[PDB]
């Protein structure tokens, strides 16, 4: 109980579904007193 290398490995194999490997993307959204460089587009209306 001394040391315990923390970087153990998940074993991914189809035999594993609660243990089924899933690829996750996490979005974090924030604004701080600057122009919102992220925007939502608006289409052209015929003039």
């Amino acid at each position, epitope marked *: *109980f001394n040391c*315990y*290398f923390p*970087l*153990q*490995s*998940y*074993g991914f194999q189809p035999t594993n579904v609660g243990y089924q490997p899933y690829r996750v993307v996490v979005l974090s959204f924030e604004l701080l007193h600057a122009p919102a460089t992220v925007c939502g587009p608006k289409k052209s209306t015929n003039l």
Partner: antibody, heavy 123, light 107 residues
Framework: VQLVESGGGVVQPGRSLRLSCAAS????????MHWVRQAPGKGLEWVAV????????YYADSVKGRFTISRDNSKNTLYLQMNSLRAEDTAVYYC?????????????????WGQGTLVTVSS | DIQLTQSPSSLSASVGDRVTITCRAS??????LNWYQQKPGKAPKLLIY???SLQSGVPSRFSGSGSGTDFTLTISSLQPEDFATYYC?????????FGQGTKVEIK
């Protein structure tokens, strides 16, 4: 996971030899790596262990001073430098990895071995 | 250097027989023996780790027990593929060492 060994053969007593163990199929750089020998017809005798980073190095009592284990994490290859070889050092040498079941990470077990290479010390 | 002694060194038994292999450590490691199976000419296979827990892919007939200095490898129903040399191995402290091996032979 593959552990292919090479470098064995016949050597006259007292000279030097280098064993090579190429690893593949797993992340080489974060695992401890072992050598184990088995002379013809006798039991398994532990030889040497090297840390993942090559800093921690331990050897069996009979090989202290003469045998040197090494590591190259770039080519994912394990080595054992043999020096002052003698008759009792004639054996089949295996390279192998620590490995664990993960849930039970209180064992630091053993797992997949190399196929083994024959070292015969005879003039 | 902790010494591991296996008893008996060899034994003869028949298919289906209840097979017992004992491993004794020089000092207590108390849950840290690992058992291996080796056929001649091929690398050993881990059967029991932590002295009481089964490896994945190993049949349930293989069971490990014992604690401290007295440990037991048991095969409930001996099978034709179980005839081999079995080694106990401690991982409590460095350097790592092996028992001499118990050869299971055909009676």
């Amino acid at each position: 996971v593959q552990l292919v060994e090479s470098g064995g053969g016949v050597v006259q007593p007292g000279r030097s030899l280098r064993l090579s163990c190429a690893a593949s199929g797993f992340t080489f750089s974060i695992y401890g790596m072992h050598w184990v020998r088995q002379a013809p017809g006798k039991g398994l005798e532990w030889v040497a262990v090297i840390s993942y980073d090559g800093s921690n190095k331990y050897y069996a009592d009979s090989v202290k001073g003469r045998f040197t284990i090494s590591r190259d994490n770039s080519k994912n290859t394990l080595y054992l430098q043999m020096n002052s070889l003698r008759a009792e050092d004639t054996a089949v040498y295996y390279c192998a990895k620590e490995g664990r079941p993960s849930d039970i990470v209180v064992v630091v077990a053993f797992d997949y071995w190399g196929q083994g290479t024959l070292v015969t010390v005879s003039s | 250097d902790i010494q591991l002694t296996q008893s008996p060194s060899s034994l003869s038994a028949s298919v289906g027989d209840r097979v017992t292999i004992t491993c004794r450590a020089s000092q207590s490691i108390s849950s840290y023996l690992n058992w291996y199976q080796q056929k001649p000419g091929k690398a050993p296979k881990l059967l029991i780790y932590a002295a009481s827990s089964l490896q994945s892919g190993v049949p349930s007939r293989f069971s490990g027990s014992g604690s401290g200095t007295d440990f037991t490898l048991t095969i409930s129903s001996l099978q034709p593929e179980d005839f081999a040399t079995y080694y106990c191995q401690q991982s409590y402290s460095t350097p790592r060492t092996f028992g001499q091996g118990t050869k299971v032979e055909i009676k």
